[PDB]
């Protein structure tokens, strides 16, 4: 029961950790794409304000 | 900490842009504009998880809150 318990705990932790890392990796790349998208909007607003000027 | 960090980096900026010839001329006239002492604030600025009483404290985030307010206050004063 000891061996079985050690193996089980290690497994469930390994699985949940891997999932958490995957979640953080996805959220990072989300912000990376969003910054790129915000930057292009900002450039577009800059261009527009200059045209009015 | 945030107060002295902002004051430190403002003095650094002011020193960096101060005309070098004027600096030496003042030194010869016996009125040296005293160069600020260097400090070691970076490790504190890199702290994202200070473990205190079971809490995880983002020191970087907290400093930024104040430093950003100080930047805005500087700009308001200039205008």
């Amino acid at each position: 029961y000891t061996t079985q318990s050690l193996a089980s705990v290690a497994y469930l932790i390994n699985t949940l950790a891997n999932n958490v890392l995957q979640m953080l990796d996805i959220q990072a790349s989300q912000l990376r794409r969003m910054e790129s998208s915000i930057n292009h909007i900002s450039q577009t607003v800059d261009i527009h304000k200059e045209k009015v000027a | 900490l945030a107060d002295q960090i902002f004051a430190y980096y403002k003095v650094m900026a002011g020193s960096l842009l101060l005309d070098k010839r004027l600096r030496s001329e003042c030194k010869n006239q016996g009125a040296t504009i005293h160069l600020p002492p260097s400090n070691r604030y970076e490790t504190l600025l890199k702290q994202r998880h200070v473990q205190l009483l079971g809490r995880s404290i983002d020191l970087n985030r907290l400093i930024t809150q104040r430093v950003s307010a100080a930047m805005y206050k500087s700009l308001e004063l200039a205008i």
């Binding site: 318990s5 705990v9 469930l12 959220q27 915000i38 909007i41 607003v45 | 907290l62």
Partner: protein, 92 residues
């Protein structure tokens, strides 16, 4: 004391090891839950930002330089933009 049976100590101390794995399972769950709750909280903000970023793209494409008039009422009748000034204190 010291008079206990060897095999009896072995079994009791192995049973306590399984208890340690029980508490370690609870300790692990708490750790993963605290991290999940923060990242989950970020998800709501990320989704809410992504939609704001997308409907701004639309609003920005529809800007017309030839059309846009400049109003002096933006100075006298409407407030100046202020960015968030919220600061965290009393963290304990």
């Amino acid at each position: 004391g010291i008079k206990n049976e060897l095999e009896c100590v072995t079994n009791i101390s192995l049973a306590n090891i399984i208890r340690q794995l029980s508490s370690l399972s609870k300790y692990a769950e708490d750790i993963f839950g605290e991290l999940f709750n923060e990242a989950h909280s970020f998800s709501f903000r990320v989704n809410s930002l992504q939609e704001r970023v997308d409907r701004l793209s639309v609003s920005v494409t529809q800007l017309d330089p030839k059309e846009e008039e400049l109003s002096l009422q933006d100075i006298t009748m409407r407030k100046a933009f202020r960015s968030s000034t919220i600061q965290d204190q009393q963290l304990f």
